[PDB]
Design a protein around this nucleic acid. Structure first.
Ligand code: ZN
Ligand code: ZN
Lengths: 91, 127, 63, 214, 202, 97, 25
RNA sequence: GGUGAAAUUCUUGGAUUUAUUGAAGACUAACUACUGCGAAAGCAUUUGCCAAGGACGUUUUCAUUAAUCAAGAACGAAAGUUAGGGGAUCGAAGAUGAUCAGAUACCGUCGUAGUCUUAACCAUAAACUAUGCCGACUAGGGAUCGGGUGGUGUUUAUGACCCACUCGGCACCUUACGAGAAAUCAAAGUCUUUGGGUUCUGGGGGGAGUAUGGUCGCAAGGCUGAAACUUAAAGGAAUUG
């Protein structure tokens, strides 16, 4: 029983605002509300009180992360860069 | 007791120039191009003009009093012709003719790996 | 004043637009045993004395 | 305007003591004027030279060496071995068609507080009583010889500071070690190392610096 | 409230007296609660801890960098920026930093700065979608919204515009002496069209 | 009409190989189609070894040699090298000279 | 001519002919 | 600098080159071939992990479980679209300098999108071997990749090289008894001395992959598709000029 075809979650808005706008909002809001997995808690119970933070329910160990994702590609690549730099300066 | 310099010749297309320097290469001495000796804008790559400039370069080097030289030829190199210029031989000829010892010859045109797509497009430079 | 002298010994071939450039593998008389290829204009016989203003210059082909 | 050739001082270098004749180069800096003069001007002119003039022979006409200066004293200095690299002639003289190529590269920290990145190079010659044109490997042979070459090369590191490693490399005993270790695979070709490079000069160490003269 | 970047409560132990001093760092990306943090010159390099940029190698990536030693943070705090260091001149201990989308600056080597990109990236891409969210947003900052135009507005509110028609009749491209008084509409705008205007073009 | 036996070049069971540019004309061609030759002549003009030996220590030193590889494009190759065509049957030969 | 530019002309003419149908219907 | 020649641009605020370096990305040059792998499109750095592959060996195992295929699906070069990363190089548009009767074209210098990556689309090509898949038979010959078997063979007891044979593969030279209009074909042969199983496609050229419907796609467009309507040839191979 498919409740709709192409609009999915963002169909609440109805006819207003246009097509590309609410489509972009869909593609961002699914990531915004997705349930990821905290690395040092094992389970997947991350929720949001506000943007910028991701709070794991069990373990209560929150993380100050991206705007709509646990890790942006910029974060993922600069972490690797700093890793390379630390290894170079140390070893 | 022979004092050493380094020629470091650049022999590309449409011109050619040289400059003697110390063994480390930090202080270039006497830089001369074809334009220094001829003004026609076509024969800048002429080996005759190359030898005419190499003679003056050798004279200015002997003024300081240099004896032995390490010659290191380099074409345009990179993603270009990969071929030394026409004056690349007349330069050596006139330099050895103008009273100066040569030793330890080598080429240093830096061969690259495949990268940085050359110009001309897929169809290449067509007349 | 490099007014050099050289004796054409062996006519090599002929080039030029009109075929009017005679090549030669000449060697200059004073301190001989040093050879260079020159390109004279007019006809040149064997053992032909000749003068040169240039000290060194090679130009094989000429159309 | 000023004619700058008469505004420099003719200098000389001094190779380390683990070689033959050392008075091998002479350069220019500046006159003994004011505003930071030659005593503290260059302090870091890297210089190239082949091994022919450094060993006295000529069979070492390739594998040129690059040397670095650091300290100056008494119108003299003393340089430390920075690295080496083949002549471009021998590379394209050796490489030819209808054969293979093998390479490897490892970055290591020596016994002392230095680092070094080392390269390798090898080919595959056809032996006697052979009629083929190519004499290629089987792609597992290359994988085996690569790792065994890497480890047998690394065994010389972790021990033998670069000082004694220079005199270990000069007679090229490591190539004979490679031959003895890998003769079970192929009839081998001329094995070389072709490149050492450094990127962590740890500190000055004026003691070990000045330990190479007399 | 207001600032879209989150922040974190940090606590150190005072060295001069028995006391636990709390402070408010800006929450960079990758840090988690219950985490140990370092500060000073002799600190290592793991994302979150603060160092002086004079004693870190070439090519790091930092945020909340200081402009003069003692300002206690004064550059690049917003959600979606950082800064890279390029130069290292120990004599007259300055250092060149590349604010890579608008400037190349020189700063004293002892200035402060924390490694790690600032959190809240990609925030602006989300469209507002309606006036209510814009209203609520500017509520927790300023009374500079809803904007209203001036040129199209009446002549008393803008002398170079208004009336029956929507006329302009002024000029925008001002010389090097950008005087004041005509500060309505444009100011010292010269070029047009969006292209790669900088050094090292492509 | 199918002119040559092999369709274009030595390519059976690969479909696609790899492109590569010319040095003279800079045309883009498959790596297998055009030309692949070497230049291993000398680093010298008309003799001059007398001059080199007389004006250099280390007599002759190395016997120097130049090294290059050439990939002439289809049109530039026939333009420079003046051979180009062959008989209706002579094309089948594969002699280097 | 070449089938390339033939197809190009015809495909542009297709859009041109279908353009007026939108304004009509 | 740069071109056939010059011009544009830079140039005592040190020009391209020249030594220490330090940054961003693109890729794996020579090795590199009548070689390999993959259903194709495609696939060249090393190293670890992840599961899959054909050939080879078999005195192992199940016993017709098989070949092809409407309707249904997977994969799909480059360009292009949607929103992020960077933009080094190259570079449709565009801006300029040359040449030219004219040149918004070839040429010279810059230059946006693109040229890679992430998450969704698009399903096209001279997607060529222009030769559909499965299975037998008909000529000779030498190399070559992988697997395997022998040699009172060569080099350190295993690895490597040689000699004979064999299974599979990219292939190649000759000959063509045969076929074909010929170019040519080891299959394009075993065909009027007309039939081993099987899917698809075409009936002169254009109108024409055209609007019409239908269907998929936010879009470039994709799939199926006769007419009314004009005509005498268009077309393939090869011989002589
Ligand atoms: Zn948790
Ligand atoms: Zn070319």
């Amino acid at each position: 029983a498919k409740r709709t075809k192409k609009v999915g979650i963002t169909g609440k808005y109805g006819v207003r605002y246009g097509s590309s706008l609410r489509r972009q909002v869909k593609k961002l809001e699914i990531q915004q509300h997705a349930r990821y997995d905290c690395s040092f808690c094992g389970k997947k119970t991350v929720k949001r009180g506000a943007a910028g933070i991701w709070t794991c329910s069990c373990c209560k160990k929150t993380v100050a992360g991206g705007a709509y994702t646990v890790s942006t590609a910029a974060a993922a690549t600069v972490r690797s860069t700093i890793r390379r730099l630390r290894e170079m300066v140390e070893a | 007791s022979q004092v050493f310099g380094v020629a470091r010749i650049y022999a590309s297309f449409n011109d050619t120039f040289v400059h003697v320097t110390d063994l480390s290469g930090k202080e270039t001495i006497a830089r001369v191009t074809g334009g220094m000796k001829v003004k026609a804008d076509r024969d800048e790559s002429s080996p005759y003009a190359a030898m005419l400039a190499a003679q003056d370069v050798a004279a200015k080097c002997k003024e300081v009093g240099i004896t032995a030289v390490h010659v290191k030829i380099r074409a345009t190199g990179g993603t270009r012709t990969k071929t030394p210029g026409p004056g690349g031989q007349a330069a050596l000829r006139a330099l050895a003719r103008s009273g100066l010892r040569i030793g330890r010859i080598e080429d240093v045109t830096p061969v690259p790996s495949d990268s940085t797509r050359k110009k001309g497009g897929r169809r290449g430079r067509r007349l | 004043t490099p007014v050099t002298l050289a004796k054409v010994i062996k006519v090599l071939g002929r080039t030029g637009s009109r075929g009017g450039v005679t090549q030669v593998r000449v060697e200059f008389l004073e301190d001989t045993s040093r050879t260079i290829v020159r390109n004279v204009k007019g006809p040149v016989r064997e053992n032909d004395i000749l003068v040169l203003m240039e000290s060194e210059r090679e130009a094989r082909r000429l159309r | 305007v000023v004619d700058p050739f008469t505004r420099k001082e003719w200098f000389d270098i001094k190779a380390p003591s683990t070689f033959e004749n050392r008075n091998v180069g002479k350069t220019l800096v500046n006159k003994s004027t004011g505003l930071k003069s030659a005593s503290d001007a260059l302090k870091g002119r890297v210089v190239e030279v082949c091994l022919a003039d450094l060993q006295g022979s000529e069979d070492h006409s390739f594998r040129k060496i690059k040397l670095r200066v650091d300290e100056v004293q008494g119108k003299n200095l003393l340089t430390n071995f920075h690295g080496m690299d083949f002549t471009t002639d021998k590379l394209r003289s050796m490489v030819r068609k209808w054969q293979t190529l093998i390479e490897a590269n490892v970055t290591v920290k020596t016994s002392d507080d230095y680092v070094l990145r080392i390269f390798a190079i090898a080919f595959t010659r056809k032996q006697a009583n052979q009629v083929k044109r190519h004499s290629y490997a089987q792609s597992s042979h290359i994988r085996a010889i690569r790792k065994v070459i890497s480890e047998i090369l690394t065994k010389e590191v972790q021990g033998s500071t670069l000082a004694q490693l220079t005199s270990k490399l000069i007679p090229e005993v490591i190539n004979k070690e490679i031959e003895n270790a890998t003769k079970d695979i192929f009839p081998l070709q001329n094995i070389h190392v072709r490149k050492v490079k450094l990127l962590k000069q740890p500190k000055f160490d004026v003691g070990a610096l000045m330990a190479l003269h007399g | 409230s207001g600032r879209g970047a989150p922040l974190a409560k940090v606590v150190f132990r005072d060295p001069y007296k028995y006391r636990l001093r709390e402070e408010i760092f800006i929450a960079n990306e990758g840090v988690h609660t219950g985490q140990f943090i370092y500060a000073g010159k002799k600190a290592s390099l793991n994302v979150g801890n603060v160092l002086p940029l004079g004693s870190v190698p070439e090519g790091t990536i930092v945020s909340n960098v200081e402009e003069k030693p003692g300002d206690r943070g004064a550059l690049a705090r917003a959600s979606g920026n950082y800064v890279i260091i390029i130069g290292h001149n120990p004599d007259e201990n300055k250092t060149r930093v590349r604010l890579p989308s608008g400037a190349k600056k020189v700063i004293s080597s002892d200035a402060r700065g924390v490694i790690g990109v600032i959190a809240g990236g990609g925030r602006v891409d989300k469209p507002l979608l309606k006036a209510g969210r814009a209203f609520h947003k500017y509520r927790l900052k300023r009374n500079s919204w809803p904007k209203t135009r001036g040129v199209a507005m009446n002549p008393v509110d803008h002398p170079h515009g208004g009336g029956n028609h929507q006329h302009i009749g002024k000029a925008s491209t001002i010389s090097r002496g950008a005087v004041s008084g005509q500060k309505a509409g444009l100011i010292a705008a010269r070029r047009t069209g969006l292209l790669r205007g900088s050094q090292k073009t492509q | 009409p199918k002119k040559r036996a092999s369709n274009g070049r030595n390519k059976k069971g690969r479909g696609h190989v790899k492109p590569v540019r010319c040095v003279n004309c800079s045309k883009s061609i498959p790596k297998d189609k055009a030309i692949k030759r070497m230049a291993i002549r000398n680093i010298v003009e008309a003799a001059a070894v007398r001059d080199l030996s007389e004006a250099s220590v280390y007599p002759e030193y190395a016997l120097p040699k130049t090294y290059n590889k050439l990939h002439y494009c289809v049109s530039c190759a026939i333009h420079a090298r003046i051979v180009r065509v062959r008989s209706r049957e002579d094309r089948k030969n594969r002699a280097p000279p | 001519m070449r089938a390339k530019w033939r197809k190009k002309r015809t495909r542009r003419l297709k859009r041109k002919r279908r353009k007026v149908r939108a304004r009509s219907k």
